[PDB]
Amino acid sequence: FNRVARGMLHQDHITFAMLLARIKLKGTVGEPTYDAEFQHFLRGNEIVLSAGSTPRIQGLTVEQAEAVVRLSCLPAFKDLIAKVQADEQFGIWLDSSSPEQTVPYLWSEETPATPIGQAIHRLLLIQAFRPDRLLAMAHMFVSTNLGESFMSIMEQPLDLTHIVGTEVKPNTPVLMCSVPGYDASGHVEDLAAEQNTQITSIAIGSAEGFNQADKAINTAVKSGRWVMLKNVHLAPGWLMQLEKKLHSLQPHACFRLFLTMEINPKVPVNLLRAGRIFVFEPPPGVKANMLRTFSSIPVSRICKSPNERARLYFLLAWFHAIIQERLRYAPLGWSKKYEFGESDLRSACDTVDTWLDDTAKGRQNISPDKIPWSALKTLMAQSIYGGRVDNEFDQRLLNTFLERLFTTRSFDSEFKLACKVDGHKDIQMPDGIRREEFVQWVELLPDTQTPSWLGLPNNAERVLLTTQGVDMISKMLKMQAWMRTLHTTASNWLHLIPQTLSHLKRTVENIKDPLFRFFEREVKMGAKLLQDVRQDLADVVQVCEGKKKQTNYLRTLINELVKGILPRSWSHYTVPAGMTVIQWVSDFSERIKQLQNISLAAASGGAKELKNIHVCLGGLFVPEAYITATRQYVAQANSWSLEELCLEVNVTTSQGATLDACSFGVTGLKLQGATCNNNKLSLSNAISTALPLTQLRWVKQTNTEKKASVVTLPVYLNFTRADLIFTVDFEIATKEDPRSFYERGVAVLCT
Amino acid sequence: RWVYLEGIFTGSADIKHLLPVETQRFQLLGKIQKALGEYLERERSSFPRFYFVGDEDLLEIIGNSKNVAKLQKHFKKMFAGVSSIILNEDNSVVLGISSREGEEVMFKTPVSITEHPKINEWLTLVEKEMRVTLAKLLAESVTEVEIFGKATSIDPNTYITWIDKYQAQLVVLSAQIAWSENVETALSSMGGGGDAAPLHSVLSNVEVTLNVLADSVLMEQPPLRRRKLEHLITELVHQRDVTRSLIKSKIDNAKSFEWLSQMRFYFDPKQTDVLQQLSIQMANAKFNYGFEYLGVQDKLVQTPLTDRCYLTMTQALEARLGGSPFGPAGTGKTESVKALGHQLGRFVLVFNCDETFDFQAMGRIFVGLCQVGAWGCFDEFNRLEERMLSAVSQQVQCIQEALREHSNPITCELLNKQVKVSPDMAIFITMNPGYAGRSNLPDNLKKLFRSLAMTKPDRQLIAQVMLYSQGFRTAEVLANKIVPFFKLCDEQLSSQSHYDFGLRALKSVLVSAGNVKRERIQKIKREIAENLPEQEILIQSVCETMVPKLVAEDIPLLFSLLSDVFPGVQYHRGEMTALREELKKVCQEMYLTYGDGEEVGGMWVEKVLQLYQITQINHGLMMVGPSGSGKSMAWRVLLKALERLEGVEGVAHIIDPKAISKDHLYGTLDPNTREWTDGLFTHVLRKIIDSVRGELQKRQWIVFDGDVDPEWVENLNSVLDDNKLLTLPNGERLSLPPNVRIMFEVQDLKYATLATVSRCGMVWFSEDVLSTDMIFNNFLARLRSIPLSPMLQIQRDAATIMQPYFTSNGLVTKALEHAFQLEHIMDLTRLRCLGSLFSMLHQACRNVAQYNANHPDFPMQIEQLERYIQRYLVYAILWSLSGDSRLKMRAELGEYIRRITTVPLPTAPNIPIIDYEVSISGEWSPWQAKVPQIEVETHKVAAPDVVVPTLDTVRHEALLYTWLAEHKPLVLCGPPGSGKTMTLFSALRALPDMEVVGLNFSSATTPELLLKTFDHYCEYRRTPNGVVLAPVQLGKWLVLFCDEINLPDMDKYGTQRVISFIRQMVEHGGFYRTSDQTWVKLERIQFVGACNPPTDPGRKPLSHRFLRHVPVVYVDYPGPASLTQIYGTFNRAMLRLIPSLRTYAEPLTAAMVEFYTMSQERFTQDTQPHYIYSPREMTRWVRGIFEALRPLETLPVEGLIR
């Protein structure tokens, strides 16, 4: 396991451990093979069931009821349905933090099962009821088969020197494969410097690198030295030649060849087979982050200046961990996949070192409130980690973290690094003075890491964990005409989408109105795409009836339509990446029906009816144009200018629709993690909440700084937080912290 | 080898005297070559700036020791701002330095070349003395500005005298040094605990100096002093903001990070004789101001984003890293890097890097940057190929780690040799992530730099400061009006490929607004007085810049926005009377319609005037619009009108960029000899710069008519921005002369990155700009002139006959607008139809001329000619507007024409008009009379040349003869084997003086095929007043039958290279030979193409810019009865060798045809790629049966069926 997983991604560690556990299980003494249950575990989702899914006492959702009735097929779980409805604690167990730790006894067994039997039975129950914890249960299963602390060397930092001097023969090259955003050349430069081993490093390319690398290898194999070839994935042919050359060298011992590469599928297979694979990847969990950060920084470098230096690094490390593990939650956490790398930590350490040397010229025991906090809270918000930040919401997130950590009130005794980490427990600041105390504090960190450690809400990983579990099961299972269909699909779609929508009449008074200009533009674009999509599907229908011939365009359209790819021709308004044709078509039908309603409203009235209609911002081609048009309408309706105008948003759940002359209704907005009992927000644990009929008002700017309780929430078009429409100012309820709002990734989504 | 040495030995005179022993030793090659290389290397070592110089010019410089006037061309590239050297009267003692803007810097101690004859010696001395003189003058200016720095109510006279006395960069340093010392002193005084603030005194001093400067810039100033006041105002506004922030945040200590983070200056004049008097420090960095003269550079507004950029870039300069700003386009990355470089007085060399920058090129560049201690800003570093991005990471790391030994001579490893690395050098790379044509950096290289995100520059501050410096009294209100206007234009107006509302557009608007204010002031003075309407000036400039690119639907939107941001302000466009009358005249000499206002030709003159305005403002242009919109005519008319108005001769060079490989467009450098050979664009620019023929006094317009993709345009990114410089991988730098304009005549910008769109002024030519009747007027006006004298008389009366039909709502307009509703095998464009129609009407006039020649007595009178022309009009309308569609659409168009027109028409009630020709007697004659029942010989059946006449054969052959008589290129599009080659060759066999040559176009065909064909069949390359390519066989016209013309593959950006080459050499009548770059003009060359429908597999639709010049004729499969006749003829011919099968000649054919039909509907190309069934199979069938039956004498019908 250790040698294989040292060259595998952390995601596939659990699958490989489960396979090893299976091998160990089959070689035991007399316990059952348990194939009848592993079959259902692997491929039990394929059981076909028409109308047997029925939740009991409404304690289960549809997916849970389907899973339980599929699991009832096994002989042991034949009584799940009666048992779940006869117990009250099951509701508590379903909504528990870590149900895999304690699973209720629901299966019926004639004999007391071995601990492995209970482990696999609880595995099946977890897969049926709480698949989010399935992966977290799978680890427990391995713990009962191969013994706990089996999957534990992986959490520890990699030991290059031992493996290179021991477990690697000279001939086999050391392949160092880095994920997007990582590099391993620095590790080997450090290793070679530490071993006092001379290393010749060459970058591959440009047809001089080849000659230089061959000469270097030739001289090194007969003398005993280290050679690095960096980024050797841009010359696969020369890499085949190198793989052929290594097999017949018989080099001097202590010689080593290191091949740095990116993980790309064009690496030669024979080279991968003839080498030793080391995968370099972002650490799993804050604990591993801290451990490897500390292992990277020499102990001589820590505690050279006054002892407070040791604490700085610790905070720094902790800080780094957070901004490395909010990346795994990219929509909710860092809205963009930034490359917060090890160079960031090295530069942060260098600045801390230089400015703490300058602030205290050798004298020890510097005051906690005299350390240059300003020189670090800003060089690391505006020059080191803010260098990569693009928008201002991520920048305000970074500034929130920095202002909450790198403060004087962090040398206290009750300082809380994180809060509500277990729903009530707070990660306490360790009271150390020397590096080793902080390293031990790190190593005693509980293995119950939750996104609440990161500042994110606890349900920020449910979808991710379920997907991980499904991927694990799929990997295990894997390792163990179209014309009629398209005709039916296209005919159903053409029935689904409405017919062409009517344009808007151009009158002498309507042409000037900005609302009318925007609505006309929208209806015209909608009619254009409606004609195109309908005739394209009609063409596909006729092709699939055999009546119409095959065109190069029709070929491309059908080829990408049977596969479920949204055609490039249909994509003219912004849609989230990876949108399927079915979702796209339902969305298109929604947008066209909204535009039809707009057209009828405009026909009924020209000026009094284009402003009293509620427009769905999500189902709109260019909502920015709608915002500008509403602003322009309010500017023209009075003497006010465009610049001297600002937006105020009031949520009206009552749907009374007492719209003011300067107020426009908007429907379909979604808060991501907060509720509006009034016009005031409030943090909540629900993923999203619908806001019925938010009123947008344009009022003249007063250039007055907003209150403390007011937060600036971005509004994005869709869940892919990659496009700003506008920003709203919401006052928060009493006993709320705007910093908590910033960290928990609260936003508003149009779609 | 021998030739290079022979050439370089003759470049100078004294070089032969130098090393006289080897003169006969050469005239052993390796040792001589290496000795010369080592001489050049040690000479470059003596004067490191020689590394910026190539050998071809270094040899001249060393040789031209006596003639110093020759050296005054190499100084522009050896220095940053230095342009010339001010010598003595006898040109023996250099006295000073002259910038290119005219700002002398006189040495305190002149260098006498008499006692330092060697070029390197006195060049080093002049460099050192430039540094020393700048240092001493800066010290004196610092003392002077310290005299009135510590005072209030400065008199403008002394302040202006000080400004005029000293250089611009020295003035800016003086002011910043004084302010830094003042703030240091104030914070020190209040550093002894919280007390009263002498910081308010510094703020007040800054405010009063700023008030003095603003009033001084309100009145007219000399331009140089205007720029000096520009710099000072920007700087002191920055200082005012900084001091105001310090007062607001209540900083008590000189060590607080609110003050350390600010960039501070420390002048210590008592330092003992070195350039280290001035030390510039930011948070913890410490740079010694390098004393490089920079002339007069344009200072930037120091916005908070620029401050963040300074912070990050100085932090990266510490720790010997490099700075790597990134972001969207036009956010000031390059200019901020240059601003920092010139702020520290560094020699900054900007490079525009493309994929041609390789390991050796970057290595030589780094050798230069290291030896000289000059900064390097490599714009678009991600446009290198990722292999080279990885390869040069080794060199960058070698430099950085070798450079860190200074913080500990120092030399490094570059190109297998040791070079001296100076601490002053830096490496900067500016990138556009996520843009097309960009590579992805290795993670090995991303750790050698410090990235910085520059996404949203502070545009409001830039606008406010720029307007305030320009003299706008309401600068704040103007900025608050204008920046929200741009952010609302970016949202309300529709996103177009040519639309740009970024920072570059706003900067252009501000510069134009300043110019308009100055012009309005001058106009008022011709007729203090600072009650100008400033908002009107803003609307003036905006409408002069943002409107030309507006699409029809976004014009009302922008003007509503202008009316809502600037309420009550009115815009009144100028009249431009002199240019308008010149344009009207020029349009008269070129048979073009002129108009004013709503008249016919109005929108076109507005377009050409807007084009003139944008030409005034910008130096990179793009005329964007659908083909057939008058772009080319607009710019040609403007060039002629400007030539005759201003009196400057206007010369234009038209280049197709995509018709050649960019190795030929920009040039290359062979890896072995390391010798640079020019491309096409570079050769033109070098000829302009080296104005041997006085090219610098003319209006040079380099026009790029072709396709724009981020592969060759980006090589001119450094040319279309404020740099105005072209960078070559050779390291040569070519400055764009002020009289040169670069324009791109394009039809769309779908495949162009925003980086190039922002750098150019967009003028949008709608298709409504050039109206239909405008083209009709041009056609008729060219008809009544331009003899194709009795010929002219026929043309004139024919045009008189055609007049009532070519009406704005006449026959041709209604016919064309109806034909747009038909289905054509190719996309139907107006100009293609009109061109075919005009060529056939010219052929009608030629037919009348031929008839009148054939009757020396009784020529055709007005009545006969009237009938003939007015019937040929209907004939040609039908053929042009439906010659590319199937029979049903041709019949439908004929029916509509019959329904609308009143021309006499054939009376047959059930047959289409397309079956009817017009005889020379002006009568409708059926085509059926021209197709006889031919009797083929009993031999030579299905022979290659045997064509059985058919309706569709005579009609198509007549049409092709019509088109080929006027030598007009054309294309035959239809299903394979339908008879395109047969019909074309039948047409050509009637024309006796044309020789045809076949060309077969595959997916991998390049213009090299055409060039080889010309090299073989047109081997003459004559040189009369130009160069002409002519067929070898005199008196004959060469036809190039290009089959499968729509086959060659499109690249990633929708361009077929050979199609662009053909379009260029047809429309412009020639091409460029990439051996001398001379324009070669075609003589007696014409083209005909044959293709399958674009819907077919492997077939691409052709470009409309190509389709304008070639009408398309649709040759379809012969129908059932057509095949029956065609092959019954062949059967009756062949079933004659055996005179007993005669009665079987009719069923056999039917049987043949019957089977054919079945197969053609059974095995389509849907099943397999080769299941194409064509009349070629019937021809092979008849020919095969004939070959079988030829030797036999008797044969039973059973054997025949066998």
Ligand SMILES: Nc1ncnc2c1ncn2[C@@H]1O[C@H](COP(=O)(O)OP(=O)(O)OP(=O)(O)O)[C@@H](O)[C@H]1O
């Ligand atoms: N003012 C005008 N009056 C009449 N005809 C004009 C006028 N300007 C241009 N034309 C005609 O319009 C046609 C197309 O315009 P032009 O040749 O200027 O190029 P274009 O369509 O703008 O661009 P390109 O040649 O690059 O596709 C030509 O036949 C030209 O003679």
Ligand SMILES: Nc1ncnc2c1ncn2[C@@H]1O[C@H](COP(=O)(O)OP(=O)(O)O)[C@@H](O)[C@H]1O
């Ligand atoms: N802060 C600023 N003050 C003044 N001018 C600016 C500023 N930022 C950008 N500009 C101008 O805008 C243009 C941007 O050019 P460039 O520096 O090439 O930006 P980019 O590299 O992002 O394309 C330059 O002409 C520059 O003079």
Ligand SMILES: Nc1ncnc2c1ncn2[C@@H]1O[C@H](COP(=O)(O)OP(=O)(O)O)[C@@H](O)[C@H]1O
């Ligand atoms: N009316 C006709 N008279 C004689 N031959 C014909 C006729 N119609 C079709 N064909 C045959 O059809 C074939 C078309 O071949 P060709 O014109 O050379 O290629 P393509 O049609 O692809 O340009 C010729 O071989 C010719 O013999």
Ligand code: VO4
């Ligand atoms: O952002 V650019 O320097 O490619 O215009």
Ligand SMILES: [Mg+2]
């Ligand atoms: Mg730039």
